[PDB]
């Protein structure tokens, strides 16, 4: 039966159970044949699939859809035995997430789905047929796969021509290879985002050749050493260079040729000195340089040479002072200096009339310059664990200040003029409860009355 009916997954029974089957065969083989289905894993699997379809009705999946950070319909499947066929009846679904689903098969009925754009295959080996594979080759934008072995990734990944984003979160470091498995990335010439996370030691040649048309490349080695040796010069049009936890320990010399970069981050790269800003003058589109979670003794005086800085970050560093030339760039909007060993802020920061968000948490700033409050375009000011005894009385002239935090500070006085602002609610100003009671209550009722909506 297991060789004729393709139910080959019927293990032979042992003693005292084979004998009864032989007796039944001597009486009638039909009883044995009909009882044989319950001993096959295939029948159990398809019964599980049918029970999943009956249980996971259309309404349940419809209600289970969520909104992701990217503001699109998303569905998350966790530890499920399979994909219910009622899932593919949600034409409005756009993002599908699969995690720890064993032996997952994508039916052609996925072509019924139309809004689907992102696929998440976390530790799942996906088997797809020809029509569904064509449907994915035509109507799939982003792909997320998590794995620990090379083999468990889909072998048809390179067959998806219209893919735009790829997310690898596995261990591609195989046995003394130049990352052969990912070498198929040359097939996908339409790729925009590559999210390799495999603790790279050397940048694969495939990535170097494919980055000439890549837009957002993020690599996370989790502190594993990374070496360039002129590997960023091949790319000419890349804009994002996330190098989180790649153990650079120094700013690479291959980044200078990428003048088209706009967003750069070097978090947890064990940097020592960043005096190479003079080599970043070639980058006239560099506006989002991020250097937090690093070890910088002091900021070079070469920041003032650049003027295009819009998003600057040097958080979680040990810098004793901020040179005034850094304030020359007037177009900063998201400059944040949190967890820094700073002593005081120069008054030149008051010329940053275009700044929006500034985070000065965990800073030993004794006083705030009155010149800084002269700007009116400030949007966010975060102050946590700072050496402050009082708040300047000229903050009341601010009207565009959306939010401000004073947590962890040993303040004792809240000026009254703070209470007059067109844009001020309870969520915007969060401070200590005891410090909140020092202000006159007549405006508290007015504010709380408008806190509803």
């Amino acid at each position, epitope marked *: 039966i297991r060789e004729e009916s393709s139910y080959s997954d019927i293990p032979d029974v042992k003693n005292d159970f084979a004998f009864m089957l032989h007796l039944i065969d001597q009486y009638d083989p039909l009883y044995s044949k009909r009882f044989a289905v319950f001993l096959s894993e295939v029948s159990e699997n398809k019964l599980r699939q049918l029970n999943l379809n009956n249980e996971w009705t259309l309404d349940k999946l419809r209600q289970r859809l969520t909104k992701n950070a990217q503001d699109k319909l998303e569905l998350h499947l966790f530890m499920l035995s399979g994909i219910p066929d009622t899932v593919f009846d949600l034409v409005e679904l756009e993002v599908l997430k699969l995690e720890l689903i064993p032996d997952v098969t994508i039916p052609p009925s996925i072509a019924q789905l139309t809004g689907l754009k992102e696929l998440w295959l976390y530790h799942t080996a996906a088997k797809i047929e*020809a029509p569904a*594979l*064509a449907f994915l*080759r035509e109507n799939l934008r982003a792909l997320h796969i998590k794995f620990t072995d090379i083999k468990e990734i889909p*072998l*048809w990944i*390179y*067959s998806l*021509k219209t893919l735009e984003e790829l997310h690898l979160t596995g261990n591609l470091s*195989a*046995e*003394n*290879n*130049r990352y*052969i498995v990912i*070498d*198929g990335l*040359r*097939e996908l010439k339409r790729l925009k985002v590559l999210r390799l996370k495999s603790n790279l030691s050397k940048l694969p*040649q495939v990535v170097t*050749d494919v980055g000439v048309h890549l837009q957002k490349l993020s690599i996370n080695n989790e502190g594993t050493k990374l070496i360039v040796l002129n590997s960023l010069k091949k790319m000419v049009n890349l804009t994002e260079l996330e190098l989180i936890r790649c153990d650079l320990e120094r700013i690479p010399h291959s980044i200078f040729s990428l003048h088209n970069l706009q967003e750069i981050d070097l978090k947890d790269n064990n940097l020592k000195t960043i005096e190479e800003i003079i080599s970043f003058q070639h980058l006239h589109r560099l506006t989002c340089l991020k250097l937090w979670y690093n070890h910088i003794a002091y900021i070079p005086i070469q920041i003032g040479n650049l003027t295009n800085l819009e998003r600057l970050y040097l958080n979680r560093n040990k810098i004793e002072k901020i040179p005034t030339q850094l304030f020359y760039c007037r177009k900063l909007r998201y400059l944040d200096l949190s967890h820094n060993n700073l002593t005081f802020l120069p008054a030149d920061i008051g010329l940053l009339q275009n700044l929006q968000n500034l985070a000065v948490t965990a800073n030993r700033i004794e006083a705030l310059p009155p010149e800084l409050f002269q700007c009116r375009k400030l949007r966010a000011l975060h102050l946590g664990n700072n050496v402050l005894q009082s708040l300047p009385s000229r903050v009341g002239e601010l009207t565009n200040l959306t939010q401000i935090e004073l947590r962890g500070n040993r303040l004792e006085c809240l000026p009254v003029e703070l209470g007059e602002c067109p844009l001020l609610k309870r969520s915007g100003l969060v401070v200590e409860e005891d410090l909140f009671s020092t202000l006159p209550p007549e405006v508290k009722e007015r504010l709380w009355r408008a806190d509803k909506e």
Partner: nanobody
Amino acid sequence: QVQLVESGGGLVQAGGSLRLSCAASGFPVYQAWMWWYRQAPGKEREWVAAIESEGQYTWYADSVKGRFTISRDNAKNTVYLQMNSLKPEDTAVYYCNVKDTGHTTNQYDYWGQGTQVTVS
């Protein structure tokens, strides 16, 4: 179905000219972005030659750049690779690799049988 067979692989003294050929299947040679791979003994399999569909652009690794010429020939569904003056490091086993199938039914990737070439 879809299958590929290597041919032309053989031992040859250094400096000779070799023309590896592949016999393909129902998938178009004009389509079906194609690879010529090598596996070296005492080493890991590494890609050598790449021929693309819709433009016929050639890709090579730096170690195999300069003295290897790959092409795809239609009306006979063949992939050819010429190596001139092969060095001793060329001793390996060469396969034809299909990473993208034809226009329709987009069948899974299949590895070639392979032929062993040796340089003395």
